[PDB]
Each structure stands twice: as structure tokens, then as C-alpha cells.
Design a binder for this molecule. Structure first.
Ligand SMILES: *[C@@H]1O[C@H](CO)[C@@H](O[C@@H]2O[C@H](CO)[C@@H](O[C@@H]3O[C@H](CO[C@H]4O[C@H](CO)[C@@H](O)[C@H](O[C@H]5O[C@H](CO)[C@@H](O)[C@H](O)[C@@H]5O[C@H]5O[C@H](CO)[C@@H](O)[C@H](O)[C@@H]5O)[C@@H]4O)[C@@H](O)[C@H](O[C@H]4O[C@H](CO)[C@@H](O)[C@H](O)[C@@H]4O[C@H]4O[C@H](CO)[C@@H](O)[C@H](O)[C@@H]4O)[C@@H]3O)[C@H](O)[C@H]2NC(C)=O)[C@H](O)[C@H]1NC(C)=O
Ligand code: XVH
Ligand code: CA
Ligand code: CA
Ligand code: CL
Ligand code: K
Ligand code: NA
Ligand code: ZN
Length: 805
């Protein structure tokens, strides 16, 4: 019930929300059907339009007008945005030459530069170049302020997931808004774009910027606008709030625009009908900037121009139907569109089986335009699994396509020419970032970054302390003139042991053999110094990684490679080696094919054994440092040490062997040498965090050798590839992957072909940030470089996407 009989007289767009059943006048009252009777009349005036004309100049104040051209309007803070241009011979903001803003130039009373977030739905990254002729305001913001070629949204590339990520710094799996449409098994409730349930506070986790600000004593304008409030009214409202007395005036504001997304759904991302929407957005920007300039706030305010996702071409004829794959199509519910989410229609059906559903959706048609996944098998870079609201079965849909249940769902619902929601590495999904103001840099391009990073910066811009989030704080310092947050390296928790020769061959009963029984003063001093660390400067280029948890491990040195060996997991946590441009691939000689050697530095009780692998019919084994790249026939023996061994499914061995034998050498040639750090990952509870011992769901049969869920590699070289990896003087260049450790290659539909036809494709899909690898291993890389910590932070958050230009 709402008792809509109160009034909005002097309450228009009140900042505090009044409690039911009293009537409301907040910018969200229309969406709850709870505005006072006189809201439209008093608060949504439209009389005479949005612009001053020559004849309105110096007029008599008529309170009915939407905005004013009277003499007293500047004091009232309620002029039309063009008042000074029309009536005082001033010029539009866009027509002024841009001058650097070395310091905030604010009116007296301002405790800090305010922040305006200008959000534009569906603003594809390419619109910046492709629409530059029709967006002079936006283009001035971009070229005078700080900008990125594009900003990467989060998956799923939808509105609410992305706007709430901006607001919180969190992955959707952590903030809860994991789609535009959701079911929560625990609440037994559903979340839709239409309706009431989307307003209930239990869906929304984390701590959004407006709450972060309020708790720390910074006042916030209300971020949301009811859909029927015209854009011009939103701008005038923000401008009005900026005129308030120092004690009531907010420090952070938000504007949202439904365009260009609304039009892009109808016309496609580049429909000729798209030029007008891009013009209107620019005009709106102009109005804001002209309004700020009237109030002397245009060299005081920080403006963030930001999109939620891009837009792709999608039509009805490009829809795949699950009814062409499944018989039991009515025992299932599907969340449809640019992503698939399948669950049972009824929990009382005990015959429904996810296993056979996946199988039935796997590589069934030669051109298939979606791929089924158990959520835990989705690429780790998507961070899309650890939430009860994400269904166990997910369909990653090809760019340009749709997935629906039955064909009736499509025609009983062609309407659209555009859509979005695909994998967030897809070019057409990229969106924009521009920052303009005294705290941002002047005329500066920065590299592409991810939207999870903005929350921290917005907090820096406001003098706030961020709530714990998934940004990496300091990784976007290069955006800022000042107010930079100065981060320290996390402290190492566990210090390594450095074991020497402590055990005799005969103490090992591992069930391993090696043909290593063939027999000098010059060359024996040489191997000693290698096992103490004479080549360590060569293979450990950026320091040893720090172990940020409590554990027991050993550093092991060798001619060709260095490792941190875990006595708890019985394998290395990491192995580090450098392959230079000139290095040569060799084979595994016949006599050493099944050779596994005891490591005399590590006790039998902390080693694996061959018998476990013999007795396990499913599991085989592999090596972290590849024997193929041994520097000499003698060094090659080191690669067969039981401490270099890790568990591998024969299906995964095909992947790993091709990566080690072919791809490593390929990258060394292309990149002028590479440093490689490789290791196992354990994430049985799919939270993106390193599992402790008691979380491991699978061991090698009849042993305590734990099975990794993934294998990573970090490949580093010099950004200036004229300098070889091992002698680099400048910035570094990195790419990484987190390969799922799977007993079959069902994910790659071409896996019965030669490895050169599918392997590198799989690796690309599983590309990763070093930071992803850090969360999953509890290690901290790049501890000793000649580079600044902020710059390293940026490097760690880099993602190599393999998307073209
Ligand atoms: C990205 O960044 C985020 C933010 O930093 C990272 O997530 C954090 O990770 C922490 C570790 O996983 C986690 O800490 C836990 O806190 C638990 C209490 O949680 C409440 O309080 C927080 C803080 O205010 C709040 O944010 C939470 O809100 C969640 O839950 C509701 C729904 O229930 C949602 O509204 C909201 O969206 C959010 O959901 C998300 O997070 C939770 C994780 O808590 C997930 O379950 C959801 O799927 C969703 O993703 C909560 O209101 C606390 O209970 C935990 O403590 C247990 O474990 C410790 C280990 O130290 C142990 O000592 C304790 O015994 C305890 O175990 C007991 O309970 C167990 C389970 O019932 C049981 O098995 C045991 O036997 C014990 O009885 C834990 O310390 C922190 O909450 C989240 N924060 C957020 C916002 O998600 C994230 O890791 C980052 N991602 C990456 C990849 O780096
Ligand atoms: C810094 C990000 C601010 O966070 C947000 N900003 C705007 C919205 C929002 C979403 C949809 C619509 C709409 O009209 N859809 C038809 C309107 C608004 N709105 O006006 O607020 C949501 C959020 C979380
Ligand atoms: Ca959107
Ligand atoms: Ca985990
Ligand atoms: Cl969705
Ligand atoms: K085996
Ligand atoms: Na296959
Ligand atoms: Zn949309």
C-alpha cells in the first residue's frame, strides 16, 4: 500500500528515501508505483523545452518552465544548460581549446573534486573511431583526458552483471547478479528484468560504491533513474544537486543511458539507424559539460565515460535448437540467448541425468555453434562457477548465434538484429573507458584493462578505502595524475629448505627403473656447482616466487631448471626455466623411455612412486621441465628425477607433450627466448582459490599423490624483442594459460586429428592472467625485477586474447 496523498512540494528528487506507506519523490519512485500525486506536475516539468532562445534571455521567472533563462537562475542553480551561450555570449565547452588541468579549480566550500559516472549501455569499443565525426563532445573528452582503446567487460556480457561489477569490483559469481535472469534454489525465488523481485536486497551482494562512500562519510547522489525520466531531466537534476549547500551536496553522481543498446538490438551494431542515437548521447554529454562550465565546475569535476558491454550482429535464422539434439527436451528448463544455462524442469524427476545431456550436446553436428560445459570446466578466466545461482550445465555460444529450447520459443515470443552476452574476450563485446578531470592524466592513452578494476580507482578518486574486491589495487595507477595508492609486496609466509645429498639410492623402493648405470675431476666439480645454483640466474629471471601460505617445500637446483618442491603435495608447486632463441629440441632416447630416478635430496617418504602409476589404469605421468629441451645428453638425466614428475591422464599427455615439444620452441624463436614457469593447480571446489589438502577429491590409486585439476604456464620475455629474454633492460611481455586436466579431449571436436590442428586452439581458449594463477596457487611472481611495482601489477593483470585487431 502507498498513501499517495502527501506532496512533493520542495521535495523533488530527495536524496534520502522515505518509508512506506508514505509517498515518495525520489528518482526511483515511478518504478515502484509510489510517487506522490503531484510528482509529474512539480518534478517532471517540460514546459518550453530544454534550451534557452534569444527571446527568453533575462525573462521573468515562470516556475512552470522545465529550465530557466531568467537573471536569478545561476543562484537558483536551475538554468538551461545553454543559458550562458545564448544570453551571455559564452561559448560551448566543446568549442574551447583544451587546456591541461594541473590542479582542481573548484568553488570555495568544495572539500574534494566530485565524481560523475556517465554510463552508456551497449557502447561498443569501435564506436569511438567509427562514430567520431558525429560525437564531438565525447571525442574531446577522449582526446584531452585519459583513455583506453577498449575496456573488457565481465562474462556474461550483460547489463546488470556488468553495471554491478563496475559498482562493486566483484566477479558476478561473488556479487550474485550472475545474469539478467536467475533462479536461486535456496530462496526458491526468481529474478527478472521485468517485475518487483529484482528490487529485493538479498540478491545484491558485496559493497557497491554508494554504500562504501556513505559509510565513510562521503555523500552520494542516488545512482538509479526510472526509465520514464528523460535524459535532459537527469542532467538538470545532477546539476541541481551540485548547487546545494556544502553540508548536503553529494560528492559522487551517476547518469545512465539506455542508448545505444536499445537501438542496437533493433538495427545491429552498425545499422545506418545507429547514427542518430550516437548523436543524442553526444548532445547529452555536451549539456552536462556546458552545465558544469556555467557553475564553474568544468575544471573541478572528474568525469568517467564508461560502457557496460558492446554489441554484435545476431539474427533469428542463426539460432540452434536443443530439440535437434535431445529427446527429453520437456524435462529441462533453459535460460536462452547468447548463453545457455540448463537445469531440470522438476527436482522430483530422478531420471534426469546431466551426464547424458552433455554427451548428447557434444560435437554432434559438424558446424555446431555452441559448446556444452560442466560449469567447473569453463575456462578459468571467466570466473563463472562459484555460485548456487549458476546452473551446473552451461552452453558457451558462438559469437553471432543464439540458443533456444524449441523453435516455438523463437516465433511465439523477426524482431532483433543485434545482441550481446557472449564470452568476454570477443571483440564485438568490448566497451569503452574515458576519464577526464584534474585527478586523471592529460592527453594519455593507457592499455586495455578489465572493468573489475574501476571500483578501486573510483574509491581512490574519492579518498575512500575499498571493500575487499577482485581488482588488483595499484594496477591502474598509470591512469592517475595523483591520489595514487602505493601498494607493498605481500610478505612471504613460508621459507624454503635447501636440501643437499641426504639419501642413498638403495633407500628408495619406488618401483622405478632407469638405464642410468654408465660412468673425471673437471666435470664433477661442474655438476656440483649446477646443483648449488650456478645457472640459477639464467633460469630464475625474476626471483623465486613467494609462497603466501603455511607449507613445507624445498628449492631444487639443476643445470637446466629450478623448482620449488612441495613435501605436502609430493610434486613441485612451480618449475622455472629459460629457453633461448638458439636452443635446440632433441628426442627422448630409447633406453630412457620409462626411466624415473630417485632424487637423493628428497626422502622416499616425500616422493612419488612408479608402482602407484602402474597400478592406476586411468592415470599416467608427465614432466614439468620437458626432457626434449635438455641442454646436453648429461643434463637430460635431471629431467627424469621423480621430483620433476606429475600425474597426467593419457588424453592430457597429448596436449602437454605437444606444448613442450613444439610450442615452447616456437615461442622462443618468435619472441627471442622465453622464460617458462609451469605447475599444477588444485581447485576441486571451483572457487578460483588454492585448495588446502583436505579439499582434494582425487588421488592416484592407492597412494597419497594428489591429482591436479589444472596445469598452468607463465611465458615471459622482453617487450622489445631485439633484446633476448635473459638480457632484458625494459618492460616485460607475458602470456599464460590454465589448462584443465581432463581424462578425455571431448572439449576439442578435432582431437582425433594431429595435435597441430587443435592443441594451440585449446590453449588459446584457456588463456589467463598471471593474477588468475596467483589466486589458484597462493604464489606471488615477479618479486625481483628492475621494474616499478605498479607496472608489474599491470603486467600481472594482462590477458593475451588472441583476438585480431
Ligand atoms: C573476489 O573477491 C571476493 C571478495 O573479497 C572474494 O570472496 C571472499 O572470499 C572469502 C573466502 O571465500 C569469504 O570469506 C568467508 O566469509 C564467510 C562469511 O561471509 C559473509 O560475510 C561476507 C563479508 O561481509 C559477505 O560478503 C558474504 O556474502 C556472501 O553470501 C551471500 C549469500 O550467502 C551473498 O549475498 C553474497 O553475494 C556473498 O556470496 C558470495 O560469497 C560466498 C562466500 O562467503 C559464496 O558462498 C557465494 O557462492 C558467493 O560467491 C557473507 O554474508 C565465512 O562464513 C567463511 O568462513 C568459513 O571458512 C573459514 C576459512 O577461514 C573457516 O575458518 C570457518 O570455519 C568458516 O567455515 C564455516 O562454514 C563453512 C560453510 O558453511 C563450513 O564448511 C565450516 O565447517 C564452518 O562451519 C569465509 O571466511 C568472503 O565472504 C568472500 N566475499 C565475497 C563478497 O564473496 C573472492 O574469493 C575473490 N575471488 C577471487 C577469484 O579471487
Ligand atoms: C556505476 C554503475 C551504476 O550501477 C547501475 N547503474 C544503472 C543501472 C540501471 C540498469 C538498467 C536500467 C534500465 O532502464 N533498463 C531498461 C536503468 C538503470 N538506472 O537508471 O540506474 C543499474 C546499476 C547497477
Ligand atoms: Ca546493457
Ligand atoms: Ca579452491
Ligand atoms: Cl542471462
Ligand atoms: K597408468
Ligand atoms: Na574430441
Ligand atoms: Zn542489451
Amino acid at each position: 500500500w502507498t498513501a499517495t496523498s502527501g506532496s512533493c512540494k520542495g521535495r523533488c528528487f530527495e536524496l534520502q528515501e522515505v518509508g512506506p506507506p508514505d509517498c515518495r519523490c525520489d528518482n526511483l519512485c515511478k518504478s515502484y508505483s509510489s510517487c506522490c500525486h503531484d510528482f509529474d506536475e512539480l518534478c517532471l516539468k517540460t514546459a518550453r523545452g530544454w534550451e534557452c532562445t534569444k527571446d527568453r534571455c533575462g525573462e521573468v521567472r515562470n516556475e512552470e518552465n522545465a529550465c530557466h533563462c531568467s537573471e536569478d537562475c545561476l543562484s537558483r542553480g536551475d538554468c538551461c544548460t545553454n543559458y550562458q551561450v545564448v544570453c551571455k555570449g559564452e561559448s560551448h565547452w566543446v568549442d574551447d581549446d583544451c587546456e591541461e588541468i594541473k590542479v582542481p579549480e573548484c568553488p570555495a566550500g568544495f572539500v574534494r573534486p566530485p565524481l560523475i559516472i556517465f554510463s552508456v549501455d551497449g557502447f561498443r569499443a569501435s564506436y569511438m573511431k567509427k562514430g567520431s565525426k558525429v560525437m564531438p563532445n565525447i571525442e574531446k573528452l577522449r582526446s584531452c583526458g585519459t583513455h583506453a582503446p577498449y575496456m573488457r567487460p565481465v562474462y556474461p556480457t550483460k547489463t546488470f552483471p556488468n553495471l554491478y561489477t563496475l559498482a562493486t569490483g566483484l566477479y558476478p559469481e561473488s556479487h550474485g547478479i550472475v545474469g539478467n535472469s536467475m533462479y536461486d534454489p535456496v530462496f526458491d525465488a526468481s529474478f527478472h528484468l521485468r517485475g518487483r523481485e529484482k528490487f529485493n536486497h538479498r540478491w545484491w551482494g558485496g559493497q557497491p560504491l554508494w554504500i562504501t562512500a556513505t559509510k565513510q562519510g562521503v555523500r552520494a547522489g542516488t545512482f538509479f533513474w526510472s526509465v520514464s525520466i528523460p535524459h535532459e531531466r537527469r542532467i538538470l537534476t545532477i546539476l541541481q544537486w551540485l548547487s546545494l549547500p556544502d553540508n548536503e551536496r553529494p560528492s559522487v553522481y551517476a547518469f545512465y543511458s539506455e542508448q545505444p543498446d536499445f537501438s542496437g538490438h533493433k538495427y545491429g551494431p552498425f545499422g545506418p539507424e545507429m547514427t542518430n542515437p550516437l548523436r543524442e548521447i553526444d548532445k547529452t554529454v555536451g549539456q552536462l559539460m556546458d552545465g558544469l562550465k556555467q557553475l564553474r565546475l568544468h575544471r573541478c569535476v572528474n568525469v568517467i565515460f564508461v560502457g557496460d558491454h558492446g554489441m554484435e550482429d545476431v539474427t533469428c535464422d542463426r539460432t540452434e535448437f536443443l530439440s535437434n539434439y535431445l529427446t527429453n527436451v520437456d524435462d529441462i528448463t533453459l535460460v536462452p540467448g547468447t548463453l545457455g544455462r540448463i537445469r531440470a524442469k522438476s527436482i522430483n524427476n530422478s531420471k534426469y541425468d546431466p551426464k547424458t545431456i552433455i554427451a548428447a550436446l557434444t560435437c554432434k553436428k559438424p558446424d555446431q555453434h555452441f559448446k556444452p560445459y560442466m560449469k567447473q570446466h569453463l575456462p578459468k578466466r571467466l570466473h563463472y562457477a562459484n555460485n548456487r545461482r549458476i546452473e551446473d550445465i552451461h552452453l558457451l555460444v558462438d559469437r553471432r548465434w543464439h540458443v533456444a529450447r524449441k523453435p516455438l520459443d523463437v516465433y511465439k515470443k523477426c524482431f532483433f538484429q543485434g545482441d550481446h552476452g557472449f564470452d568476454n574476450k570477443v571483440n564485438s563485446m568490448q566497451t569503452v573507458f574515458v576519464g577526464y578531470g584534474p585527478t586523471f592524466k592529460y592527453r594519455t592513452k593507457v592499455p586495455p584493462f578489465e572493468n573489475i578494476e574501476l571500483y578501486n580507482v573510483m574509491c581512490d578518486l574519492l579518498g575512500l578505502k575499498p571493500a575487499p574486491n577482485n581488482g588488483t589495487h595499484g594496477s591502474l595507477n598509470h591512469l592517475l595524475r595523483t591520489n595514487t595508492f602505493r601498494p607493498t609486496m605481500p610478505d612471504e609466509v613460508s621459507r624454503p629448505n635447501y636440501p643437499g645429498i641426504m639419501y642413498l639410492q638403495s633407500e628408495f623402493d619406488l618401483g622405478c627403473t632407469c638405464d642410468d648405470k654408465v660412468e673425471n675431476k673437471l666435470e664433477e666439480l661442474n655438476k656440483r656447482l649446477h646443483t648449488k645454483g650456478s645457472t640459477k640466474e639464467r633460469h630464475l629471471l625474476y626471483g623465486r616466487p613467494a609462497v603466501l601460505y603455511r607449507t613445507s617445500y624445498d628449492i631444487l637446483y639443476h643445470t637446466d631448471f629450478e623448482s620449488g618442491y612441495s613435501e605436502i603435495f609430493l610434486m613441485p608447486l612451480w618449475t622455472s626455466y629459460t629457453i633461448s632463441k638458439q636452443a635446440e629440441v632433441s628426442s627422448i632416447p630409447e633406453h630412457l623411455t620409462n626411466c624415473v630416478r630417485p632424487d637423493v635430496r628428497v626422502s622416499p617418504g616425500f616422493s612419488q612412486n612408479c608402482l602407484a602409476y602402474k597400478n592406476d589404469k586411468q592415470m599416467s605421468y608427465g614432466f614439468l621441465f620437458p626432457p626434449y629441451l635438455s641442454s646436453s645428453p648429461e643434463a637430460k638425466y635431471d629431467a627424469f628425477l621423480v621430483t620433476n614428475m606429475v600425474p597426467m591422464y593419457p588424453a592430457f599427455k597429448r596436449v602437454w607433450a605437444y606444448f613442450q615439444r613444439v610450442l615452447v620452441k616456437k615461442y622462443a624463436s618468435e619472441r627471442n627466448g622465453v622464460n617458462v614457469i609451469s605447475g599444477p593447480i588444485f581447485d576441486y571446489n571451483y572457487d578460483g582459490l588454492r585448495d588446502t589438502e583436505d579439499e582434494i577429491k582425487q588421488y592416484v590409486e592407492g597412494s597419497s599423490i594428489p591429482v591436479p585439476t589444472h596445469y598452468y604456464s607463465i611465458i615471459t620475455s622482453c617487450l622489445d624483442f631485439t633484446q633476448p629474454a635473459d638480457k632484458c633492460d625494459g618492460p616485460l611481455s607475458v602470456s599464460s594459460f590454465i589448462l584443465p586436466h581432463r581424462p578425455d579431449n571431448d572439449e576439442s571436436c578435432n582431437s582425433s586429428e594431429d595435435e597441430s590442428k587443435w592443441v594451440e586452439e585449446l590453449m588459446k581458449m584457456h588463456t589467463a592472467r598471471v593474477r588468475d594463477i596467483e589466486h589458484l596457487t597462493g604464489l606471488d611472481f615477479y618479486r625481483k625485477t628492475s621494474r616499478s611495482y605498479s607496472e608489474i601489477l599491470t603486467l600481472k593483470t594482462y590477458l593475451h586474447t588472441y583476438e585480431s585487431e
